[PDB]
Amino acid sequence: EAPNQALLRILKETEFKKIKVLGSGAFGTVYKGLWIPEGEKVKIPVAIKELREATSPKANKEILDEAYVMASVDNPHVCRLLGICLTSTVQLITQLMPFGCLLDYVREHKDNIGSQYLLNWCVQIAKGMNYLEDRRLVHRDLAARNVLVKTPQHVKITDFGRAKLLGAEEVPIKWMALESILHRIYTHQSDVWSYGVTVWELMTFGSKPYDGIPASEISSILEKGERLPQPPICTIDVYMIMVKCWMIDADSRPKFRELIIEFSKMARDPQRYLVIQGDERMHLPSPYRALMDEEDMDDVVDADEYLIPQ
Ligand SMILES: CN1CCN(c2ccc(Nc3ncc4nc(Nc5ccccc5)n(C5CCCCC5)c4n3)cc2)CC1
Ligand SMILES: [Cl-]
């Protein structure tokens, strides 16, 4: 196979300061932070994710593996790893996304969320997924929760902890495809099914899937031929696309490139495909933004605009 020549970058702790805790879960906590490269004189807003001071080795293999994947991908619609800090315990530095995860975002802003936005995200997510397919990577955990908003217009995929190379030996039941659920079989197409759910989450503005239903339950339910309900705002076409994602035969499921194309068409005439009350009225925020508490963000540069050789 091809050699991975991605460069892994190591950063001194002195380089960045962690302002706040974005979230804490399990043994891992993520902080909003500012990173300054050594001679660069640029300030970068970053998220630092560190697994616990507890340094259990099993965990470490896990965090490092995720970083390896993140280091290895370049796309507008996929999150990438800025570098790593080895002090005390490994931490991952990646560009901060100000608006947080999409799933939270839909729930919070649902009244103000446009049809055009929903389709665009749908298109954007597909583009990111397609890139991974190009890189032969199976995310193996795509969810609305795992999509981050740089801006309302722009979103990218993340959480590559579960990611594996295709055909490699090497738990979100609801997202998971049936083949994966029954047989622990994962393929991009398995990935595609997950995308369909993600679309469903967005379409319903963050509604839970198979809500009130136990996970053990799900395999049979799927077995029956049951599937998620058409969302109220979903036109028959848009829904129909979703259903294809949930097909028993994976080869039957639509390819990611195909998905990008179909949604893209809809985005031209968003109103036709999604019906929302007051669609015209809604508008959404943009970035200065200075979310971090700094007087001096003259030099702030986004990670997207911050580049290094190779
Ligand atoms: C209503 N609240 C909800 C929480 N909130 C918020 C959360 C995240 C962000 N942005 C942001 N950016 C990059 C991230 N990279 C990882 N995670 C991450 C994963 C792998 C490597 C490095 C970072 N995260 C995690 C995703 C899980 C939840 C905590 C933030 C990230 N989060 C901005 C605001 C403030 C508003
Ligand atoms: Cl689940």
| N- and C-termini, Cα separation | 20 Å
CATH homologous superfamily name of the largest domain? Transferase(Phosphotransferase) domain 1
Gyration radius (Cα, Å) is 20 Å
Strand order, biggest sheet?
1-2-3-5-4
**Percent of sequence in beta strands:** 5-15%
CATH class of the largest domain: Mainly Alpha
Please estimate the helix content.
25-40%
Q: Would you identify the CATH architecture of the largest domain?
A: Orthogonal Bundle
Q: Order of SSEs, N→C?
A: EEEHEEHHEEEEHHHHHH
The set of bound ligands, ions and cofactors reads: the ligand CN1CCN(c2ccc(Nc3ncc4nc(Nc5ccccc5)n(C5CCCCC5)c4n3)cc2)CC1, chloride ion
* Major sheet size, sense and barrel closure: 5 strands, antiparallel
Number of domains: 2
The count of DSSP E runs of length 2 or more, i.e. the number of strands, is 9
Total helical segments: 9
Question: Structural class, from helix and strand content?
Answer: alpha+beta
Overall form: globular
CATH topology type of the largest domain: Transferase(Phosphotransferase), domain 1
Would you give an account of this structure?
GO terms for molecular function: actin filament binding; ATP binding; ATPase binding; cadherin binding; chromatin binding; double-stranded DNA binding; enzyme binding; epidermal growth factor binding. ATP binds at residues 22-30, 49, 94-95, 159. It is found in: Cell membrane; Endoplasmic reticulum membrane; Golgi apparatus membrane; Nucleus membrane. The active site is at residue 141. The modification Phosphoserine is found at residue 286. With 310 residues, the chain is of the alpha+beta class. It folds into two domains: 1-96, Phosphorylase Kinase, domain 1, CATH 3.30.200.20; 97-282, Transferase(Phosphotransferase), domain 1 (Orthogonal Bundle). It is built from nine helices and nine strands. It has helices spanning 57-71, 102-109, 115-134, 178-183, 188-203, 215-224, 236-245, 256-268, 270-273; strands at 16-25, 28-35, 44-51, 81-85, 91-95, 137-138, 147-149, 155-157, 164-165. The strands form three sheets. The protein has a five-stranded antiparallel β-sheet, with helices on one face. The chain has a two-stranded antiparallel ribbon with strand order 6-9. Helix 3 packs antiparallel against helix 8 (256-268) and helix 5 packs antiparallel against helix 7. The longest helix has 20 residues, at 115-134. It is globular and about 55 Å long. The two termini are 20 Å apart. The relative contact order is 0.14. It binds the ligand CN1CCN(c2ccc(Nc3ncc4nc(Nc5ccccc5)n(C5CCCCC5)c4n3)cc2)CC1 and chloride ion. Chloride ion binds at residues 172-174, 215. Chloride ion binds next to loops.
